[PDB]
């Protein structure tokens, strides 16, 4: 069930690792090939995977519409990359030593245990309040003042890509006299100025 | 009175899990946020009572690590200080966990 576990952590559940659209990853029942008081860590480890799938299920559907939202999605693909990288590292380990235990992966995968729950709720606010427009630039910044150095350096990267859209529309407008917008995205709608959608900082 | 008659090496593995902060262990079954040794554990030696003695001490250490894990849990699931305080505590646990995990090897 070693290789069975890694695949479940990548988005492919099985019989021993059932899937639910409401709860998420969870151990099904008791198995005779597992320790009676070991199922604990697997359920805790599965909570790391349950976040991962809801990422992809949100990414693939892209669901709300707007370039800033869509570009925020691709920005979310960059931060998840070390999670894809570090998980693949274990493959070289077990093929080398086939007798490793289930405890080692928890000791290796502690850093990602903390990053997701802080960034996962950032997605929840968007799906629960319909944050449409440039206001996404503030919701990512409002949590950018977080205390955790890794969580700060993660959303920092998304901001570094999310601004990649604003700078472009800002450049094509402040230099050529036309605006590239069709969904009430830019904060400039005889033109006027918008304050209730203007960024915070 | 019946007893389970566990082997010897199995205890050390269980003790390592208690050090790790994991719950729901065949030994050290907590009841009210207070880890407590079971009553039917016995080895071929150690007359069934010294085992209850030696485990009772390690249990006292489990309380120190179980309560802290309960604290870190109640922060993950904008104070900016407790949240910044656990990150120091959390950082210490990872390194401490590595020494315990290595022994299991």
Rounded to an integer, what distance in angstroms lies between the CA atom of residue A104 and that of residue A98? 13
* Gap from A149 CA to chain B (nearest CA, Å): 9
B22 inside 8 A of chain A by CB: yes
Backbone angles phi, psi at A27, to 5 degrees: -70, 140
B94 inside 8 A of chain A by CB: yes
The pair of structure tokens assigned to A73 is: 């999605």
Is residue A15 classed as helix, strand or coil in its secondary structure? coil
Helices and strands (H, E) in chain A, number of each type: 8, 2
Q: Which of B20, B84, B98 lies closest to A147 in CB terms?
A: B84
B88 inside 8 A of chain A by CB: no
Rounded to an integer, what distance in angstroms lies between the CA atom of residue A141 and that of residue A155? 8
Rounded to an integer, what distance in angstroms lies between the CA atom of residue A145 and that of residue B20? 31
Closest residue by Cα to residue A114 from A51, A168, A31, A159:
A51
Contact call for B14 and A37, based on CB within 8 A: yes
The pair of structure tokens assigned to A98 is: 């086939």
Rounded to an integer, what distance in angstroms lies between the CA atom of residue A20 and that of residue A179? 45
Q: Which of B22, B76, B98 lies closest to A117 in CB terms?
A: B76
* Helix ranges restricted to H, A63-148: 67-79, 81-96, 103-108, 111-129, 136-142
Query: How many cross-chain Cβ pairs, A to B, lie less than 8 Å apart?
Result: 43
Contacting B with CB below 8 Å, chain A residues are 36-37, 39-41, 44, 101, 103-104, 106-107, 110-111, 114, 117, 146-149
Q: At what angle do helices A67-79 and A39-61 cross, to 10 degrees?
A: 150
- Alpha carbons within 13 A on the beta-carbon side of B57: 5
Contact call for B104 and A117, based on CB within 8 A: no
Backbone angles phi, psi at A26, to 5 degrees: -165, 145
* Gap from B56 CA to chain A (nearest CA, Å): 19
Chain A residue numbers with beta carbons less than 8 Å from the beta carbon of B21 are none
- Check: CB of residue A118 under 8 Å from CB of residue A143: yes
Chain A residue numbers with beta carbons less than 8 Å from the beta carbon of B92 are none
CA angle A147, B23, B53 (to 5 degrees): 120
- Long-range Cβ contact pairs of B51-58 (< 8 A, separation 24 or more): B55/B11, B55/B27, B55/B28, B58/B15, B58/B18
* Gap from B76 CA to chain A (nearest CA, Å): 7
Rounded to an integer, what distance in angstroms lies between the CA atom of residue A18 and that of residue B69? 27
Rounded to an integer, what distance in angstroms lies between the CA atom of residue B30 and that of residue A139? 41
Transcribe A52-74 into DSSP letters: HHHHHHHHHH-----HHHHHHHH
B38 inside 8 A of chain A by CB: no
Closest residue by Cα to residue A68 from A115, A132, A154:
A132
Distances from the Cα of B53 to the Cα of A34, B41, B42, B66, angstroms: 29, 12, 12, 20
Resolution for this PDB entry, in angstroms = 23.2
The pair of structure tokens assigned to A17 is: 């690792």
Say which residues have a Cβ less than 8 Å from residue A166's Cβ, sequence separation at least 6: A68, A134, A137
Closest residue by Cα to residue B59 from B3, B104, B2, B15:
B15
Q: Kindly state the helix (H) or strand (E) to which residue A18 belongs, with its residue range.
A: strand A17-18
Rounded to an integer, what distance in angstroms lies between the CA atom of residue B13 and that of residue A32? 18
Instruction: Give the torsion through C-alpha atoms of A139, A142, A144, A145, to 10 deg.
Output: -170
Distances from the Cα of A47 to the Cα of A38, A117, A131, B77, angstroms: 15, 10, 26, 11
Q: Which of A37, A39, A110 lies closest to B94 in CB terms?
A: A110
Chain A residue numbers with beta carbons less than 8 Å from the beta carbon of B12 are none
Rounded to an integer, what distance in angstroms lies between the CA atom of residue A147 and that of residue B85? 9
Tally of residues, chain A: 201
The pair of structure tokens assigned to A135 is: 């206001």
Buried b (16+ CB within 10 A) or exposed e, B53-90: eebeebbeebbebbebbeeeeebeeeeeeebeebbeeb
Closest residue by Cα to residue B14 from B32, B45, B41, B39:
B41
Q: At what angle do helices A111-129 and A39-61 cross, to 10 degrees?
A: 40
Say which residues have a Cβ less than 8 Å from residue B93's Cβ, sequence separation at least 6: B21, B68, B72
Rounded to an integer, what distance in angstroms lies between the CA atom of residue A55 and that of residue A120? 8
């Amino acid at each position: 069930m070693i290789h069975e576990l890694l695949l479940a952590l990548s988005g492919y559940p099985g019989s021993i690792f059932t899937w639910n659209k409401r709860s998420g990853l969870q151990v099904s029942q008791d198995f005779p090939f597992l320790h009676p008081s070991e199922t604990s860590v697997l359920n805790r480890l599965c909570r790391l995977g349950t976040d991962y799938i809801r990422f992809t299920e949100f990414i693939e559907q892209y669901t709300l519409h707007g370039i800033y939202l869509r570009a925020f999605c691709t920005g979310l693909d960059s931060v998840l990359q070390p999670y894809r990288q570090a998980l693949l590292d274990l493959e070289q380990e077990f093929l080398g030593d086939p007798h490793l235990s289930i405890s080692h992966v928890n000791y290796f995968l502690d850093q990602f245990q903390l990053l997701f729950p802080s960034v996962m709720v950032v997605v929840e606010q968007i799906k629960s309040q319909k944050i449409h427009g440039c206001q996404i630039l503030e919701t990512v910044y409002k949590h950018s003042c977080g205390g955790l150095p890794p969580v700060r350096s993660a959303l920092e990267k998304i901001l570094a890509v999310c601004h990649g859209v604003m700078y472009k529309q800002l450049s094509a407008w402040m230099l050529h006299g036309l605006l590239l917008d069709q969904h009430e995205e830019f904060f400039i709608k005889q033109f006027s100025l918008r304050v209730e959608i203007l960024p915070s900082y | 009175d019946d007893r389970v008659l566990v082997t010897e090496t199995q205890v050390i593995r269980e003790t390592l899990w208690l050090l790790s902060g994991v719950k729901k262990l065949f030994i050290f079954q907590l009841i009210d946020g207070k880890v407590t040794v079971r009553n039917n554990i016995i080895v071929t030696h150690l007359t069934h009572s010294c085992l209850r003695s030696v485990l009772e001490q390690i249990a006292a250490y489990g309380q120190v690590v179980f309560r802290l894990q309960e604290f870190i849990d109640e922060v993950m699931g904008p104070f900016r200080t407790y949240q910044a305080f656990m990150w120091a505590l959390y950082k210490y646990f990872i390194s401490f966990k590595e020494e315990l995990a290595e022994i299991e090897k």
